[model samples]
Target chain A: DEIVQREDGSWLVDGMVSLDRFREFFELEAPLPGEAGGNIHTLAGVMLYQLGRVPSVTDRFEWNGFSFEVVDMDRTRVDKILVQRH
Target chain B: DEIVQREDGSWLVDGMVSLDRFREFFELEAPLPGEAGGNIHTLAGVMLYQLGRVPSVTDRFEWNGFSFEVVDMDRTRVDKILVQRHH
Candidate 1:
């Protein structure tokens, strides 16, 4: 439940946050809360599903009008993410 | 979405089925629909989570009054599961 804001205005957060929590925290409107399917349990899983594969550190993506970059990861598991609203 | 029933009364199903379908098909009452967490994406993921690690073929487990065994797998992914309800 920890979040950090860098000077660049990007939010750094743990990848383990539940999708429910992530959506509520960001107040995102798309994808709908509780709409995640297939057994996805965390934000990292959502990232993997969207990326269509595991991501490496520094991989950046745009979704729901937000910019997301992989800050840290362990192979298939995303450890930290950098988020910025566009 | 294919399921097989053996003469032994166990149901054989693909590991790709969603947990929602799995629980409904079996009419299971626990674990609650939409309750799974932790990056799980399929029934296979649920099995792996329950096992606490990737499992090999023939590994058996019991949960929610049902008996489960790994019918097939590929490395870290489960491909088949055999399920039976306890009497």
Candidate 2:
């Protein structure tokens, strides 16, 4: 019951969350590409998408010189995603 | 007599020459391939040949991906060599 309640609460939650805290809870590994641990890249991508600067990932995305890898992601608790440059 | 005297005196010199002085004499550059300083790789190669660890450089040594470059060299004094990852 506690797990279910926490899961439900997490889903409905809507506020700023630190990526470092998210990484600790999910046991994320290090040596990420491009830059170190931070949500700046994610926020940038989202902002660019919202502004129509680039097409959505749901649609076909063009291959650019830059590349990224999602080290971790959890949709329910937090929409946490780690990225790196290749 | 002084030139010949010193020349003969220097020819009889039996001591280690500093690699840094050798570099200054030759004006070498940095970021060479492999390890750094004191002729370790070259000495190793020579020792290996003497001990039969491998063949001589004159025999056309085989390539094993490891490579090195002589950053600088001088005949009148010790030679300075720089080693690095590739260049």
Candidate 3:
């Protein structure tokens, strides 16, 4: 699915995504291929565990590209979900 | 200048980019072109000032796509900067 859809609002790509599963869920490109991806994802988890306020109003999130995609499927098909950010 | 170069290391884009200037510096697309852009940039600045520890080992940053670019610039051409995030 090369058709990339996106918006300008900062997104807080939320979900219980594993490193291996992330590729299936998303088509993360550039800058997020190797150690960089691990570094951030780990930190994000740390932030969520420590802070636990991701996507909350006091806390906001924004990424730069058409990064997070929900591999189009009906509600029943997917096991879980991630949400969009403001 | 359609060349997009990037890496897997979550970059902490470090720069003080005006919404206007960002376009000149970057070629942002999709969910990053409207109010969403302002929301993030503003929040990022707020986070930077409040935390002041962005990119610090205490924290990390990561985004999903090949979003940031340096615009093929040298030291003299620009006024401020932003860094890459491993967070």
Candidate 4:
């Protein structure tokens, strides 16, 4: 329920959510880490792993028809995410 | 000596270089953490600490009249840096 749509219609999500929270947006491959207690913790970890680098504010990427942009960060920890259909 | 000017006259520096390597570019505040063995290990650490966030490839920032851009990275580790005068 951390995902909310803005008046502009883009989804704003809490970065601390587990990767599986986006299951409605796309499916995770079997054995892929998806939980906060998994090998990877939050969605930020999954994004960073996929990006293969740390990201500054405004950095974004496309995945499975969804666009994910960093909305906020606290130090190296991602705090907010902006999601939109791609 | 990791800093080198490209044919275009931009400085290409190794990310592993200590932040103090830029002493010619500007002065580090006395007692400021510097050096690969100091409070931080490399230029990348200094940049990240200043940025307060991780960076993606091509991310950049301006500091002390100089521009620092990410040229290459190994996961979270910055690999190469491109420096140039802001003016």
Candidate 5:
């Protein structure tokens, strides 16, 4: 199944996670930029992972002169993993 | 002889100088009160002479806060009379 990892030790979900799961993991509070502040580090990690999966998603984000580069990912802290796949 | 020889030479026979002589000697300036300047000394001399003769002249001369008194008179220099006046 796409949701199970038989060999690589990575979970491959059938498709994207649910919106509720996304909200719970990423902790989004508001829609507009600069509207909310909490969990920014976790939100950034999840966003980077999603962006890597869909590289074109970078174009949809507001690019107000800042750039993102992912360095590492550790999935051991899964609750906090927001997405360890930085 | 009354007009010819007055002993003190003070010439007491002054029946007032003639209009022509008074005008020649006094040289009356314009009558507008504050219109004239310059000859204030001469005017003051004439005014003081007339004032001494009649104390009542002081009241008619239109005093404006200044008090004037005659201190000395030398007939030889009639124009340079000393006045002890204060404002």
Candidate 6:
């Protein structure tokens, strides 16, 4: 599913994501945190938070092969996120 | 004019703005791009972009003595903003 919603109520998409896909969120392959375009779940939450989800930084949830990590600045909003590929 | 909409359709507020004031945006006094809570208009677009406005970096607009600046990472969303105080 290019744009799949998780059972835990998260949204994700695989492969090359276009930046202009969703109205609530914007998608891009830009690297974030430790690297650019870090991981799938991070990208998912990026869209979610961009869509106005109050997702906090450092919140972790499971994926089949990876888990999610929220990353942001000291005085910034809860936006930047990362992933742990298990 | 706190929470005032500009003639060009930009939304702006003055003084200490509560973070939860808008559902489409969030406000904070955090330092961004260059300095903390850089300027008034920057904070305004921060709310607008937080509310999903396609505000871009290097984009500048005017206020009485302050202007807005869009600041973000290499590929991040158009969020971080700064203010230009004109003296």
Q: What TM-score should be assigned to candidate 2?
A: 0.18
lDDT of each: 0.66, 0.25, 0.31, 0.61, 0.28, 0.39
Candidate 2 Cα deviation (angstroms), residue A85: 20
User: What is candidate 1's CA lDDT for residue A16?
Assistant: 78
Per-residue accuracy of model 6 over B27-54 as CA lDDT, tens digit each: 3343432223544234444535443355
Q: Residue B57 of model 1: what lDDT?
A: 55
Model 3 lDDT per residue over A1-86, tens place: 21112233322232334534444445544343233544544223423433343322123223433333221111222211123333
Put down candidate 4 lDDT per residue, A1-86, tens digits, no spaces: 56656544676666677655566344554332333445685677866765545665456677666777664445576656667775
Q: Chain A TM-score of each model, in the order shown?
A: 0.81, 0.27, 0.30, 0.73, 0.24, 0.36
TM-score for each predicted model, relative to the true structure: 0.45, 0.18, 0.22, 0.41, 0.17, 0.25
Question: DockQ values for all predictions?
Answer: 0.01, 0.00, 0.02, 0.02, 0.00, 0.02
The candidate with the higher TM-score, 2 or 6, is 6
Per residue, candidate 2 scores C-alpha lDDT tens digits across B19-39 of 243234335454112325334
Candidate 5 TM-score for chain A: 0.24
* RMSD each, Å: 17.9, 24.6, 17.8, 11.4, 51.5, 15.0
* Candidate 5 TM-score versus the reference: 0.17
Error of 5 at B72 (Å): 0.5
Lowest summed lDDT across 10 adjacent residues in model 4 chain B is found at B28-37
Top model number, lDDT: 1
The 10-residue segment with the lowest total lDDT in model 3 chain A = A71-80
- Relative to the real complex, the DockQ score for model 2 comes to 0.00
Ranking by TM-score: 1, 4, 6, 3, 2, 5
Clashing pairs in 2: A33-A85, A34-A85, B32-B84, B33-B84
| Model 3 bad stretches (over 4 Å) | A1-86, B1-14, B31-58, B66-87
Please, what are the lDDT tens digits per residue for candidate 1 over residues A1-86?
Answer: 54556555667666678776777888865662224575786777777776657776556678768887665554577766667888
